[PDB]
Amino acid sequence: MRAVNWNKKEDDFSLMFWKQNIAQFWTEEEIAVSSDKNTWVQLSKEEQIAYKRVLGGLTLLDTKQGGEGMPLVLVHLENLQAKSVLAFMGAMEEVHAKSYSHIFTTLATEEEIDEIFDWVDTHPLLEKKAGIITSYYRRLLKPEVTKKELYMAMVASVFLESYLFYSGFFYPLYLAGQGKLTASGEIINLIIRDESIHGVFVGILAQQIFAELSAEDQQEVQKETQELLMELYEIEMAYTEEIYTSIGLVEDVNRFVRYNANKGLMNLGLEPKFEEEEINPIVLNGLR
Amino acid sequence: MRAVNWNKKEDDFSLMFWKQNIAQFWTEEEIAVSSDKNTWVQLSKEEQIAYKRVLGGLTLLDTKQGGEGMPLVLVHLENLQAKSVLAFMGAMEEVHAKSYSHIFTTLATEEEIDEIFDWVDTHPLLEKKAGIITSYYRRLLKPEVTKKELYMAMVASVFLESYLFYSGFFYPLYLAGQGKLTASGEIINLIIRDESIHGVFVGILAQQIFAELSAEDQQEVQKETQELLMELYEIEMAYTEEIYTSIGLVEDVNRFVRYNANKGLMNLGLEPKFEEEEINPIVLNGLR
Ligand SMILES: [Mn+2]
Ligand SMILES: [Mn+2]
Ligand SMILES: [Mn+2]
Ligand SMILES: [Mn+2]
């Protein structure tokens, strides 16, 4: 049985991603968020509700990526160096999820927080979205998987990392780009710095597997990938309508969703599917 | 679908273990090992071979714990806070495995390193030991597992964390207790600090699951646990004879193995099975 041997490279990229994920290591204790209270209380009721709801959705996605997506993809990898990288990435999803609780503790009462997490658990669109992604992961709960199954789990992972988070990341970035909730915005920026490299790395692994598939299997997973992209898009457009209509930001968020969907596709080596548009300028300042 | 909510405790210990595992975070870049070369050359060929072989064995066990044990146990936990802790522990197993490679790079040529990893992969006792442990993990590759199956995977994990490593940890500690390879000894001590809390934590989870089982299932897994302990003990005694006869340390290592087997049992809430003996005094000096 093989032990991981970093003296003999299994690929040309796992070491650099290992080092970069460690270099980016952080935990929530590093960013105090209490100073956000001064701008939090200046938001309207509708703005506060949107913020809490999107954070709840982000927590759900990170919960599933750390507890299902990364573990079940990594257990089926043959490349032990890449497995190492995915194990660290999965731990960082748990760090991310805990950081959202850290933000909640400053912005809400214990009762309000438990109300948000009940809203998340019972939400039909979040349940549908997370069920679509995790179905690909749970297909891997068997000893022998096909490369089509592993590839599509990696596609689902890239779409979560590079695309599904961004209807939620929009609002902390949009507020931070205006000087509102800037400490929470700093945390979200650390999270995005991690998810960006997560999506790139899993997309590399996916492209490697894709190249080993037969032409027939390649055609099949290309179809599944484009169908999954649009299945998720329909759900995302319903979600943005629900979250952002009250605060007048639906079309801005939809533009941002499409921009990031194109990035997810590019991480998989695929052509963009949505017309190119420039990021919202305030969001861009919030990333600055 | 539920998101992890740290504002509502799911148990009375996962937060403290989360905080402790983060507090203990380290990576190999923090300990330069090159200064060990001066004492490395003072060792004999036989001593160097034993050191490289036991490090190879440790690397194999960490490879399997990070790549199979922690992921497959955590995927089947219902407690999302405990799941978070296990994901971080799994990542640290990959840090540990990489740190052994860092030591190898100082102590051996590239050809010598690849020879050690081939010796690991073909070794019959390491194959048998790792196969026994990972068989329990691989039973979890299905959509739903029984509590008996989960419990026995946790037992296997505690036996790996608290017992199987120690026939290997012995020799770095013994040499460090004599002032030899002290930088590598510092690394091994960081690893041990982590494995100690890994074994305690998984042992708590195991005791919880055990208490949930029917009486018939309890009787079954009690017997299987004691059988497993002694199946592994027989293999460990063969392994220590093989590794340590050349350098005259077999009975010392066997005493240390029994001491740590008792610790694994205690981490599972079980009575010790081996006679009490005090830790070898040289090893004890290597631990401080
Ligand atoms: Mn994340
Ligand atoms: Mn991620
Ligand atoms: Mn370890
Ligand atoms: Mn461990």
Author numbering:
A (entry chain A), B (entry chain B): 1 to 288
Tell me, in the authors' exact words, what the paper reports.
Ribonucleotide reductase (RNR) is a key enzyme in all domains of life, utilizing radical chemistry for the synthesis of deoxyribonucleotides by substitution of the 2′ OH-group of a ribose 5′phosphate with a hydrogen. The strictly aerobic class I RNRs are comprised of two homodimeric subunits: a large catalytic subunit R1, where ribonucleotide reduction takes place, and a small radical-generating subunit R2. R2a proteins utilize an oxygen-activated di-ferrous metal site to generate a stable FeIII/FeIII-tyrosyl radical (Y·) cofactor, whereas R2b proteins generate a MnIII/MnIII-Y·. R2c proteins generate a MnIV/FeIII cofactor and the recently discovered class R2d—a MnIV/MnIII cofactor. These dimetal centers reside in a ferritin-like scaffold, and are coordinated by two histidine residues and four carboxylate ligands.
Here we show that the class Ib ribonucleotide reductase R2 protein from Bacillus anthracis spontaneously assembles a Mn/Mn cofactor in vitro, under both aerobic and anoxic conditions, when the metal-free protein is subjected to incubation with MnII and FeII in equal concentrations. To study metal selectivity and cofactor assembly from a mixed MnII and FeII pool in the presence and absence of O2, in the present study we describe apoprotein crystal soaking experiments, subjecting apo BaR2b to a large excess of both MnII and FeII in aerobic and reducing anoxic conditions (in presence of 30 mM sodium dithionite). Site-specific metal quantification by X-ray anomalous dispersion on WT BaR2b revealed that the two sites of the metal center predominantly bind Mn irrespective of the presence or absence of O2 in the experimental setup. Unlike R2lox and R2c, wild-type BaR2b is able to select Mn over Fe in both binding sites. The capability to exclude Fe appears central for a protein requiring a di-Mn cofactor for function. If Mn binds in both positions, neither the wild-type nor the L61G reacts with O2.
